Amino acid sequence: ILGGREAEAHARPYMASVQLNGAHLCGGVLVAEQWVLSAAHCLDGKVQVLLGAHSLSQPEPSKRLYDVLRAVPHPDSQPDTIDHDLLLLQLSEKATLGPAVRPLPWQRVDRDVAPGTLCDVAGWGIVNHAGRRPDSLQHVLLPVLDRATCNRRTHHDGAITERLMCAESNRRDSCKGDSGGPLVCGGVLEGVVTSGSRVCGNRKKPGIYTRVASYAAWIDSVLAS
Numbered sequence: 001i002l003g004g005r006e007a008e009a010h011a012r013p014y015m016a017s018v019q020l021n022g023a024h025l026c027g028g029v030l031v032a033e034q035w036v037l038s039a040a041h042c043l044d045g046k047v048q049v050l051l052g053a054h055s056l057s058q059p060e061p062s063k064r065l066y067d068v069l070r071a072v073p074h075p076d077s078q079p080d081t082i083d084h085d086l087l088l089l090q091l092s093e094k095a096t097l098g099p100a101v102r103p104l105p106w107q108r109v110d111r112d113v114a115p116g117t118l119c120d121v122a123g124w125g126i127v128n129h130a131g132r133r134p135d136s137l138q139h140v141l142l143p144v145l146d147r148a149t150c151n152r153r154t155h156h157d158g159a160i161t162e163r164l165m166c167a168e169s170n171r172r173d174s175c176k177g178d179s180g181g182p183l184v185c186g187g188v189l190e191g192v193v194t195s196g197s198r199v200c201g202n203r204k205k206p207g208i209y210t211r212v213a214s215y216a217a218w219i220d221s222v223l224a225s
């Protein structure tokens with residue numbers, strides 16, 4: 001997260017770190033007892049999910065690392081595109097829920113949110129241009145950027161489909177390692193940080209997030225498998 005601040009520890013109990021050989025790979029979001037939603041491009045290394053965490057490195061009572069029974073990339077995702085950029089990770093078992101570990105309800109109405117709606121993105125992604133990686137969860141409050149402005153020639157030039165949304169990227173932004181993490185608006189999961197490479201912190205190139213409501217049938221179908 002560029003230009004953010006350290007998040008209050010365990011105040012987002014749905015935040016997950018998707019890990020590869022015990023190193024942070026992507027954000028994720030606990031959406032069901034046994035399921036973490038993330039981004040398609042995040043993923044034969046050992047993939048785990050860390051829940052209840054603030055620090056990646058430090059012992060915390062709430063911290064628990066879950067093996068993953070199944071990784072289910074969206075079957076229409078493709079490298080070289082950020083369409084359908086979701087990933088569902090079935091944990092080994094139902095996560096132990098408590099104050100620091102709780103599923104986040106996700107948006108089912110497939111309608112756009114208000115322009116400028118202040119949403120919250122958290123992650124363990126890079127925090128500056130040199131690539132400094134934070135130990136502790138960061139977050140940033142970002143206003144939603146309407147899709148029309150996001151698609152202007154000087155911006156993302158028509159690339160933003162109705163299944164995607166944008167937020168402002170003006171020095172504050174998601175960045176590398178934030179992919180797969182939550183964009184939370186009005187207390188509900190609205191979007192998932194995309195996981196294609198993109199410039200961070202450039203106000204002319206907004207952050208892109210996948211609209212979970214647009215993918216309800218997919219999510220429902222995979223969570224009930």
Ligand SMILES: C[C@@H](NC(=O)[C@@H]1C[C@H]2C[C@H]2N1C(=O)Cn1nc(C(N)=O)c2ccncc21)c1cccc(Cl)c1F
Nearest residue numbers: 025041042124125126174175176177179194195197198
């Ligand atoms: C392990 C490795 N993880 C990744 O590269 C993940 C894993 C794989 C999906 C792709 N990834 C991304 O981040 C993709 N991505 N998304 C955004 C975005 N939306 O702004 C972005 C902007 C710029 N470049 C890549 C970007 C990592 C390297 C260094 C530090 C950290 Cl903290 C870290 F996690």
